[PDB]
Amino acid sequence: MYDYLFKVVLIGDSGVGKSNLLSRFTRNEFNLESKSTIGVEFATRSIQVDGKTIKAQIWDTAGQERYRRITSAYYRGAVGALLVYDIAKHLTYENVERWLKELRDHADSNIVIMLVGNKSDLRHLRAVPTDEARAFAEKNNLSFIETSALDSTNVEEAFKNILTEIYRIVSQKQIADRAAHD
Ligand SMILES: Nc1nc2c(ncn2[C@@H]2O[C@H](COP(=O)(O)OP(=O)(O)NP(=O)(O)O)[C@@H](O)[C@H]2O)c(=O)[nH]1
Ligand SMILES: [Mg+2]
Ligand code: NI
Ligand code: NI
């Protein structure tokens, strides 16, 4: 059983590690040789927030949109988005703004967004300083975390954080809504 089913979509440039974040979170698995994502995939994991069972339904799709535009169907019903860039590849961070516009175009206007700087294990190749991404996240009302799907750092935390924020929002909406029914 679960108390909540939260659809959370992974978005971000191809190669940033979205599928490995998914595999790490849902299966504790990581693949150095993962290929670009076929179509759309989702995987689930349930976590407890405030003693409630939150079932995360995490969606994943290839980041490259040149030939294949992500439709609103991908974003539809999503209450969270993990907007992932690769800390070692500045272009993926530069594209965060385009991903934010994609969210505006395709997703619920109140979608919870977490900026995720993935591949923190590549600190020797870091192209995006943490405080820069933080400042950007703060400016854009995004939560922010750096992860490494490879070494697992902050992967649990990233998902738990976004899911908790979503939980906080919908649990409060439920209380309000119940009152409307009363
Ligand atoms: N060093 C390091 N490599 C990572 C990390 N996460 C993913 N990678 C590597 O980055 C490459 C792309 O990962 P992948 O998860 O497939 O990226 P993606 O964002 O899903 N790509 P696509 O959008 O095209 O499906 C793979 O070689 C993968 O092993 C990480 O945290 N650290
Ligand atoms: Mg992928
Ligand atoms: Ni679009
Ligand atoms: Ni109602």
Side-chain angles (χ1 to χ4, degrees), residues 85 93 115 123 126 128-139 144 146:
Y85 67 92
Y93 178 74
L115 186 62
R123 218 311 195 349
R126 177 182 291 279
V128 187
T130 308
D131 50 24
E132 176 183 16
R134 170 67 71 182
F136 176 85
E138 287 306 311
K139 189 177 173 168
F144 170 66
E146 296 191 350

Side-chain angles (χ1 to χ4, degrees), residues 13-16 85-95 118-119 125-128:
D13 288 4
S14 271
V16 301
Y85 67 92
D86 170 352
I87 64 130
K89 184 174 180 275
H90 193 263
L91 181 56
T92 71
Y93 178 74
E94 281 212 317
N95 285 332
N118 191 47
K119 315 203 190 169
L125 298 169
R126 177 182 291 279
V128 187

Side-chain angles (χ1 to χ4, degrees), residues 7-68 70-149:
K7 173 174 164 172
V8 179
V9 297
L10 290 154
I11 61 172
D13 288 4
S14 271
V16 301
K18 297 180 298 304
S19 306
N20 276 291
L21 285 169
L22 181 58
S23 66
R24 175 63 74 185
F25 180 62
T26 63
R27 301 195 307 274
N28 197 24
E29 290 175 16
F30 172 77
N31 184 7
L32 284 162
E33 299 309 309
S34 63
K35 286 167 185 165
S36 187
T37 296
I38 294 165
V40 356
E41 303 195 337
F42 74 82
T44 64
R45 178 171 159 186
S46 292
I47 63 157
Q48 301 297 282
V49 175
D50 285 8
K52 315 289 181 188
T53 304
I54 308 335
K55 187 174 173 172
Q57 188 187 265
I58 306 142
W59 287 48
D60 186 29
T61 201
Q64 181 56 257
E65 294 202 58
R66 208 259 215 266
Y67 301 103
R68 301 306 293 258
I70 297 165
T71 71
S72 297
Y74 178 74
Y75 294 93
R76 177 138 32 255
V79 288
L82 296 144
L83 201 178
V84 188
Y85 67 92
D86 170 352
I87 64 130
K89 184 174 180 275
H90 193 263
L91 181 56
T92 71
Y93 178 74
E94 281 212 317
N95 285 332
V96 163
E97 284 274 27
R98 73 85 42 167
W99 284 110
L100 252 16
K101 307 204 176 198
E102 290 304 320
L103 284 167
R104 295 193 219 99
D105 295 340
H106 295 290
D108 188 78
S109 64
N110 303 304
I111 195 165
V112 175
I113 303 154
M114 180 177 283
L115 186 62
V116 179
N118 191 47
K119 315 203 190 169
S120 62
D121 58 288
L122 298 182
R123 218 311 195 349
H124 66 287
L125 298 169
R126 177 182 291 279
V128 187
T130 308
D131 50 24
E132 176 183 16
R134 170 67 71 182
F136 176 85
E138 287 306 311
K139 189 177 173 168
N140 288 265
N141 301 303
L142 318 174
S143 47
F144 170 66
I145 194 157
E146 296 191 350
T147 57
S148 172

Side-chain angles (χ1 to χ4, degrees), residues 173-174 176-178 180-181:
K173 283 179 173 156
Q174 286 179 318
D177 195 75
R178 286 164 194 156
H181 284 273

